[PDB]
Design a protein around this ligand. Structure first.
Ligand code: ZUW
Length: 435
């Protein structure tokens, strides 16, 4: 696989040893061959698992998830997908890696899609080799792949709200269950129901992932309520997966606003990854997978592919050239390569709005392309009446940096900035000039 001008897809089934067995072998071969190598992890939890599998090998950990300082003699670097993309966007110089390994190469976050596009274009150019590791490569129509031990697959009605009766099978279970809900707000309702009935529940989401995941190993639990984030290498020692088979989809309407559409069906890749959390121990056959809906290719028209084009258009590759998306996912968006390329100053504002402001890609592009500077927050208050953000059925209020109380009413509306309490609280601080 390590020969230049080649992109290999390591599509071994979930639990086949891609990270703990195959990855150190590739690293050993790249070090032997003097290949400047990058290892891309989806999340910080996977980076810490990779450190345990690669312990002893000379790897540079460019992540705060691993307590090891580099000696300066390493030729292999390990970082998250978002860190790779962020450094490509920032004026910091990134070496030209001869070998590019991306683990969980099915991750659909905008920075993951852009990293795949950038890496695959360098391979198409003949400048590098690449390995994409995933049980479900882009384009998979198999939600029921192979496992380490047999799994009982059961199509059933899965509750998406609190219940008084009709789901005896959910609570009448002595083992541990990992339940995939379509949203944080939906998971909070089911968790409160399970808690009320005497269960121990840990809730996992994108913003709380690192801190809460530790609790699954730290203490006994009955249920884990999680969003689609646990599809990226997160491992549990459970005997059942309850899968609603639903997810939220960010959609850009008329190129003017972003809504969270759905809950709607997950893709076959997500369904296989969610099912893949169980059936991992050959000594424990009979793990259960309860699914409550079918699959659909709901990645078509998803804002993440447009946001990935926004990122790729602003990453330098060679003179005027611009990286294309990885071919099996280049049709998920109707975008012209280069149409989001910003001028030097607006591009710097675009990067600061994402890195420091923590705004979604789409919202960061609207602000930067309008010629607004990072610290100018007037746009958070001068949108139309129907762009008013609501908190507890009443318009949200913030004190501006000028000491004046104003209704939060952005010029551009992105549902992601107020999808939950933590998101809205972070957007209030942004609109107040606090970061
Ligand atoms: C934008 C705005 O001021 N409003 C929109 C309508 O919703 C409400 C709800 C509660 C208090 C006040 C309002 C009025």
């Amino acid at each position: 696989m390590l020969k230049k001008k080649q992109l290999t897809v390591l599509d071994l089934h979930p639990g086949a040893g891609k990270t703990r067995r195959v990855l150190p072998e590739i690293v050993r071969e790249a070090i032997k061959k003097r290949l400047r190598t990058v290892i891309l992890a989806p999340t910080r939890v996977v980076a810490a698992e990779m450190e345990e599998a690669l312990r002893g090998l000379p790897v540079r950990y460019m992540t705060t998830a691993v307590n090891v300082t580099h000696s300066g003699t390493e030729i292999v670097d390990l970082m998250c997908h978002a860190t790779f993309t962020s450094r490509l966007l920032q004026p910091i110089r990134v070496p030209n890696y001869n070998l590019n390994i991306m683990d969980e190469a099915h991750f659909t976050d905008p920075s993951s899609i852009a990293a795949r596009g950038y890496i695959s274009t360098r391979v198409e150019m003949g400048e590098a080799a690449a390995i994409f590791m995933t049980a479900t490569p882009p384009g998979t129509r198999d939600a029921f792949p192979d496992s380490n031990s047999p799994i009982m697959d059961t199509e059933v009605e899965v509750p998406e709200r609190a219940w008084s009766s009709g789901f005896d099978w959910v609570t009448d279970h002595s083992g541990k269950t990992v339940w995939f809900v379509p949203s944080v707000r939906n998971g909070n309702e089911i968790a409160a129901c399970l808690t009320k009935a005497g269960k121990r529940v840990i809730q996992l989401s994108r913003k709380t992932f690192e801190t809460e995941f530790q609790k699954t190993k730290n203490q006994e639990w009955d249920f884990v309520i999680t969003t689609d984030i646990s599809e990226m290498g997160a491992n549990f020692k459970a005997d059942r997966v309850i899968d609603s088979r639903r997810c939220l989809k960010p959609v850009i309407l008329d190129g003017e606003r972003v809504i969270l559409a759905g809950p709607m069906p997950v893709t076959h890749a997500s369904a296989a990854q969610r099912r893949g959390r169980i059936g991992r121990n050959p000594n424990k056959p009979g793990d259960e997978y309860m699914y409550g809906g079918g699959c659909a290719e709901t990645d078509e028209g998803h804002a993440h592919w447009l946001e990935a084009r926004m990122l790729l258009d602003n990453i330098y590759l060679q003179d005027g050239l611009i990286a294309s998306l990885y071919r099996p996912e280049a049709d998920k968006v109707a975008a012209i390569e280069g149409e989001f390329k910003l001028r030097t100053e607006q591009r710097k504002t675009f990067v600061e709005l994402m890195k420091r402001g923590d705004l979604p890609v789409w919202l960061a592009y609207q602000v930067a392309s309008a010629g607004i500077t990072y610290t100018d927050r007037r746009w958070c208050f001068d949108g139309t009446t129907n762009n008013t953000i609501m908190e507890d059925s009443v318009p949200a209020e913030v004190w501006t940096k000028y000491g004046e109380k104003r209704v939060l009413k952005p010029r551009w509306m992105d549902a992601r900035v107020c999808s939950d309490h933590a998101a809205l609280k972070s957007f209030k601080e942004f609109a107040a000039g606090k970061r």
